[PDB]
Amino acid sequence: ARPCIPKSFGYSSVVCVCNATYCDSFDPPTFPALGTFSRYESTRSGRRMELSMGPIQANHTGTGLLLTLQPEQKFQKVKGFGGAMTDAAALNILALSPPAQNLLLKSYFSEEGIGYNIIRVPMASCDFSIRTYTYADTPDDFQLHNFSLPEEDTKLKIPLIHRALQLAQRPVSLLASPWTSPTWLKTNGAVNGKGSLKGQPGDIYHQTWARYFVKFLDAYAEHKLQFWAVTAENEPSAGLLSGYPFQCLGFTPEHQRDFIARDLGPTLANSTHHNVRLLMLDDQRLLLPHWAKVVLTDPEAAKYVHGIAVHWYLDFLAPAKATLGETHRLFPNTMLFASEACVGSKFWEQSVRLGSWDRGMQYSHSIITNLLYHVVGWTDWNLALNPEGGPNWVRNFVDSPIIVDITKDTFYKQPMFYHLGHFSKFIPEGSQRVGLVASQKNDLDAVALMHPDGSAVVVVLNRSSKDVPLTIKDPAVGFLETISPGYSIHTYLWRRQH
Numbered sequence: 390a391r392p393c394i395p396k397s398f399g400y401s402s403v404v405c406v407c408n409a410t411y412c413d414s415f416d417p418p419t420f421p422a423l424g425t426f427s428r429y430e431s432t433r434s435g436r437r438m439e440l441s442m443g444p445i446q447a448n449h450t451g452t453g454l455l456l457t458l459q460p461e462q463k464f465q466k467v468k469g470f471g472g473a474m475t476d477a478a479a480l481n482i483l484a485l486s487p488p489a490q491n492l493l494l495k496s497y498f499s500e501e502g503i504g505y506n507i508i509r510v511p512m513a514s515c516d517f518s519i520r521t522y523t524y525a526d527t528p529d530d531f532q533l534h535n536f537s538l539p540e541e542d543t544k545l546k547i548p549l550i551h552r553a554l555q556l557a558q559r560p561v562s563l564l565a566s567p568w569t570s571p572t573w574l575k576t577n578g579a580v581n582g583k584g585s586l587k588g589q590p591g592d593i594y595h596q597t598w599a600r601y602f603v604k605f606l607d608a609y610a611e612h613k614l615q616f617w618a619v620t621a622e623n624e625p626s627a628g629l630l631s632g633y634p635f636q637c638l639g640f641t642p643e644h645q646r647d648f649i650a651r652d653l654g655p656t657l658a659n660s661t662h663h664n665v666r667l668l669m670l671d672d673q674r675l676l677l678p679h680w681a682k683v684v685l686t687d688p689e690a691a692k693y694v695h696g697i698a699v700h701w702y703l704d705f706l707a708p709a710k711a712t713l714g715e716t717h718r719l720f721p722n723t724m725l726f727a728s729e730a731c732v733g734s735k736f737w738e739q740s741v742r743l744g745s746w747d748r749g750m751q752y753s754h755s756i757i758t759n760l761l762y763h764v765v766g767w768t769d770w771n772l773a774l775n776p777e778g779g780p781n782w783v784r785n786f787v788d789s790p791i792i793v794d795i796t797k798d799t800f801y802k803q804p805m806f807y808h809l810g811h812f813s814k815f816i817p818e819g820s821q822r823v824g825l826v827a828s829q830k831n832d833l834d835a836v837a838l839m840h841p842d843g844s845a846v847v848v849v850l851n852r853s854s855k856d857v858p859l860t861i862k863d864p865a866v867g868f869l870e871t872i873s874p875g876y877s878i879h880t881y882l883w884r885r886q887h
C-alpha cells in the first residue's frame with residue numbers, strides 16, 4: 390500500500406522514514422489463491438518487505454538445494470512476538486505528534502504493520518526510566534495500603550497499551566516483570582547495588598513482595614488490562630553483583646525456587662489472577678540448565694512454574710545447544726520463551742546505528758535460533774528510543790527497531806523492525822513449528838511453521854554475500870522455485886490443500 394521512504398545515515402543499509410503525514414504500510418492481509426505462493430523480501434540493497442507472487446509447480450528437476458517441508462513433524466506452538474512498553478518507549482512515542490504516534494503504533498500493532506501480539510510491561514522503574522520509583526515507596530507498609538500506580542503508568546504506559554489494543558485485530562498478551570522491590574524490603578536499602586529481599590521465603594518480607602504482584606495485577610485490572618504472564622524477577626542474577634548500577638533484586642536459583650514455592654506461587658494461585666502464568670529465570674541463557682534443574686526438580690516450586698523466560702543480549706556470544714537444548718531435553722514439558730532481546734549495549738559501539746543491516750540479521754538469526762530450540766515466542770526490548778538510545782537514567786543506551794527524532798517529528802524504522810516483522814507479521818499465535826530438511830549443506834538459515842488454519846510459512850535468511858538458488862518442496866502441494874539473494878531475508882506463505 391505505501392512503500393518505504395529510504396534514508397541512509399552511512400551504515401550498510403537504509404531506514405524507512407515516517408512522520409505526521411506518511412509511513413510505509415501494507416494492504417489488508419490476504420493469501421494468494423490455491424496454487425500460488427507469496428514472497429515478502431527485504432534486502433540490504435534496500436527492499437523492505439516487498440511482495441511478489443509465484444506459481445507452485447507440480448514438477449522439479451535438477452541438483453540444486455531443496456528444502457523439503459515436514460508438515461507432520463511437529464514441534465512447539467507459538468505464543469507470539471512483541472516488545473516492551475518501558476517508560477523510555479512511552480516517553481519517546483508520546484513526544485511525537487498525535488499523527489506520528491498513531492503511525493508508529495500501527496507500524497507495530499496493526500495488520501497494516503507487522504502484527505505484534507505481545508507487550509512486556511515493567512513493574513515500576515528500570516534503567517529505561519528517567520525517575521526511580523516503585524509502586525510502594527512509603528516505608529514499612531507491609532499490608533501495601535499505599536500501593537499505587539504513578540503517572541508513568543496511568544498517563545503514559547496504560548493509555549498507549551489501550552491504543553495498541555484498539556489497533557490490533559490479533560488478541561494481545563501482556564507480560565509483567567519487576568526490576569526492584571521497594572527499598573524497605575531489601576537488605577541494602579537501595580534500588581540498585583547488591584541486594585535481595587530481607588529474611589527468607591515464607592516470611593513477612595517475601596509475603597509482602599508476593600502480595601505486591603497481586604496489587605500490581607489488581608491495579609492494571611481496574612484499568613481494564615489483564616495479563617497473560619508475569620516473570621519471577623527481571624534478571625535475578627544481576628542483584629547478586631556488587632555495584633550493580635540500576636534497579637535489581639538478587640535471587641540465587643535456590644532463593645527463586647523457595648520464593649516461588651512458598652510465596653509467589655501460592656499467592657497468585659489464591660488470587661483472582663490465578664490464570665496468569667508464572668515464568669522463571671527471565672535472565673541470560675548461560676544460567677541454564679542449572680537454574681531450571683534447581684527450581685523444577687522441587688515439586689513444590691515446579692507446580693507453579695509455567696515456563697522459563699530467557700534474555701538474548703545479541704552483542705555477546707553464548708552456546709545455545711548446551712543451554713536451551715539441554716534445558717528442553719531435561720524439561721520437555723516446560724515451555725521456553727524469549728522475554729527480552731537487544732543490541733547496541735557495548736559502550737564502544739554506537740548505541741543507535743541507523744540503517745544497520747548487521748543488527749537486523751542479528752535479530753532474525755536470533756529468532757530462527759530460538760524457534761529451532763523450541764522457544765515459543767520472542768519479545769524485543771524498548772519499542773522506541775531516541776537517537777542516543779535513551780532516555781536511560783544510568784546512560785545504559787541501546788538500539789531499538791524504531792528511533793524517534795522529535796526535532797523533525799519523524800521516526801526511523803530500522804532493519805531490525807523489518808527482520809522482526811518477517812516473523813511477527815506472518816506467524817499467528819497458535820502456529821506450530823514443523824520440520825524443514827535441506828538436501829545439501831548450505832549457508833542459509835531457515836524455519837518453517839504451520840498456521841492454525843493449515844497454511845504454510847517459511848522464513849529464509851541469507852547472511853552470506855552470495856545469491857543462492859533454491860527450491861522449497863511441500864510434498865502435499867508441489868514446488869516453489871526461488872532464490873535467496875545475498876544479504877536478504879524472505880518470508881514465503883501459501884495455502885495447503887490435500
Ligand SMILES: *[C@@H]1O[C@H](CO)[C@@H](O[C@@H]2O[C@H](CO)[C@@H](O)[C@H](O)[C@H]2NC(C)=O)[C@H](O)[C@H]1NC(C)=O
Pocket residue numbers: 394407408409410411
Ligand atoms: C513527511 O514525509 C513525506 C515523505 O518524505 C513528505 O512528503 C514529501 O515531500 C517532498 C518535499 O515536498 C516531496 O518531494 C515528496 O513528493 C513528498 N512525498 C510524499 C509521499 O508526499 C512530507 O512533506 C512530510 N510531512 C511533514 C509534515 O513534514
Ligand SMILES: *[C@@H]1O[C@H](CO)[C@@H](O[C@@H]2O[C@H](CO)[C@@H](O)[C@H](O)[C@H]2NC(C)=O)[C@H](O)[C@H]1NC(C)=O
Pocket residue numbers: 656659660
Ligand atoms: C486468599 O484468598 C482470600 C480471598 O478469597 C483472601 O481473603 C481476604 O484477605 C484480605 C487480606 O489479605 C482481607 O482483607 C479480606 O477480608 C479477605 N477476604 C475473604 C473473603 O476472606 C486471603 O487473604 C488470601 N490469602 C492470602 C493473600 O494469603
Ligand SMILES: CN(C[C@H](N)c1ccccc1)S(=O)(=O)c1cc(F)cc(F)c1
Pocket residue numbers: 456754755757758761825826827830831832833834835836
Ligand atoms: C543448521 N541450519 C542452517 C543450515 N544451513 C540449514 C538451512 C536450511 C535447512 C537446514 C539446514 S538451521 O537449522 O537453519 C539453523 C539452526 C540454528 F540453530 C540457528 C540458525 F540460525 C539456523
Ligand SMILES: *[C@@H]1O[C@H](CO)[C@@H](O)[C@H](O)[C@H]1NC(C)=O
Pocket residue numbers: 447448
Ligand atoms: C510434469 O511432469 C510430467 C512428465 O513426467 C508431465 O506429464 C507434465 O506435463 C509436467 N509438467 C507440468 C507443468 O505438469
Ligand SMILES: [K+]
Pocket residue numbers: 523524525526527535536537538
Ligand atoms: K505509592
Ligand SMILES: [K+]
Pocket residue numbers: 733734735736737738739740786787
Ligand atoms: K552503546
